[model samples]
Target: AQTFLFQGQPVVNRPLSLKDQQTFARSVGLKWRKVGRSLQRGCRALRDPALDSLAYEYEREGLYEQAFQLLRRFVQAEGRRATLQRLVEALEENELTSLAEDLLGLTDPNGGLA
Candidate 1:
């Protein structure tokens, strides 16, 4: 069993399928065209969820700064525990302890908005 649920399914235990990724992006208020960005020129047309997915992709490719920046914006804008925890886990799993801690610091202990 996974530790977290999204759309009534355990998200933590399984890798997100492309459809699921699009669903998550939509749920987090991201549009499709906002996601894809050219490398040499760079871009900023993404929001959270789209940015979140992009961040994950960047992290997978070892682009720590880019990933962190996107995650930071997502967490700051979203402030949901589940989302924050997801980012925290990703950062920690990637050995970005300090950034994880900093992100965790934005958490609301009382379970309200951060």
Candidate 2:
């Protein structure tokens, strides 16, 4: 078993499969392409999940800024619709709504529309 973290807490769960990881990565990549870059440039589709899994490992080590940077492109690729919806979901769940707004540029006075 392996340990992971979310919102600053340790967690244990079934490891995501290589296939699952790749699929998720591909989806994330497609979404992120709008941002004009791809984190998976040197990575094969089969390795996407592995990359994503490893990214979480870094994220768990209090390296959120780095992790977020690595994954920010994808989140940005996920677009305002996806990002805003995810934020709404998190905030509604009483999670990090404030940060979500910041990430979505929703908090900026001149950041402008969704």
Candidate 3:
């Protein structure tokens, strides 16, 4: 078990299942537009995927389907694998603590659906 001590917190690290990876996208897809917008606001180290197609709008824009992959890209492109701290902070910033807790493993994951 890899303990990712990011931000001085104990975070167990594991390969997130595909289902878990995109499940949260729906949460944002349905009612987390603000979170989707802020995910890229004032935190750009690299430009978005498209030069013009990415501006932010249409509640169901790229976020409705790609938020997960996009966030995954952000984390992988920006820092260590433990960079989930930033993601969690973003979720918490918008009162998504339950989602964050679930993500943090406190609420348990999909539980190896084999």
Candidate 4:
């Protein structure tokens, strides 16, 4: 098991703080839009491929918890569309078959397919 420690914390199950994440977002001129109550306010998750990139990082770091959390949140928010498909790509080699099963439900957990 490879442990990828960032800032003295294991990457698994740990969500990056807003300030840390903010720095990255700010570097791309996205800071201005993140202000106010909702961190995800006006933050488009539709067709978001960035989550896949994050998933790759998680795999590299062995941070399955964080990776799955990201996927779960996206699935809950975006449903199983393009964004969810992007997330699945990151796991193809790693074989998170459980996640795949869950995501299958994402589109139509109760026949509410997206």
Candidate 5:
């Protein structure tokens, strides 16, 4: 019943299983800085002073710990359907198909890439 689809296929059939969330996050966490610091812009928009501080932590803790923490935080704070889809859009341009596939529950219906 999810409106969000990958290459015209519905992603999740229900709310995310805990393992699915963790799996998806682990990948996104590992990538945001290592390959996609543009996600910093995603981080910057949080604007909450406490959350905002993560940008500094990002500089130190780096491409795994901090980025993963931030992804979980952002997902919790922002709501997954919209927030996750937005993330997919961002990564879409970057050709982070790994993320896009994970986002779609790893069944990956994304077709634009050839």
Candidate 6:
């Protein structure tokens, strides 16, 4: 088994399942928003797919702002028409209209005017 050090503690290198990530994210001392940010950053650093799962975790916790931020990064990278549209709709359904419009503008090539 591969072992690494984190905060001077030995950490095992193994398949990091999503449930493990969720537990870690929720158990961290930092606020949920900050934890989400750290998760997103870590995912970017490793080019990992965990950001999407992390975003959903945030969303499930009603941390829509954090979720939107992470999802925005995905939209910027993938530029999937449906992804942006669906995210905006979800935000709107959550009564985060302003945030939804803001994210739509940022992700939409046409500034979400269409």
Candidate 2 structure quality by residue, lDDT tens digits, 1-114: 343444553223322223322333343333322211232432222224534554465455433332334444334344332222322232234344343333433344564221
Which residue segments of model 2 deviate by more than 4 Å? Answer: 1-56, 59-61, 65-83, 112-114
The TM-score obtained by model 4 is 0.25
Cα lDDT for residue 61, candidate 2: 41
lDDT against true structure, model 2:
0.34
> lDDT tens digits, residues 1-114, model 1?
234533332223322233333333333232222222311122222322464565566556344333334434433444443243454344333344443332323133442112
Model 3 score (lDDT)? 0.50
lDDT, candidate 4, 1-114, per-residue tens: 222433333222222233322232233222112221122332455245554555465556444333334434545564534232343333333443343323333223352222
Instruction: Give the range where candidate 1 is weakest over 10 consecutive residues by summed lDDT.
Output: 31-40
Off by over 4 Å in 6: 45-114
Clashing pairs in 1: none
Worst 10 residues of 3 by lDDT: 50-59
Candidate 1 local Cα displacement, residue 49, angstroms: 12
lDDT, model 2, position 56: 60
Instruction: State the lDDT of candidate 6 residue by residue for 4-113, as single tens digits.
Output: 43333333333323332333333332343443444344344314665566656566655444343444444455543323333333333334444433332323344322
Q: Which of 3 and 4 is ahead in TM-score?
A: 3
lDDT of 5 by residue, 1-114 (tens): 345665554344333334444555467664554323444454444435533466577667554455555555555654544345545545655667666656545545542212
* Ranking of all candidate structures by their TM-score, best first: 3, 5, 6, 2, 1, 4
* Model 1 TM-score relative to the real fold: 0.26
How does candidate 6 fare on TM-score? 0.34
- The lDDT for every candidate, in the order shown, is 0.35, 0.34, 0.50, 0.35, 0.50, 0.39
Clashing pairs in 4: 107-113
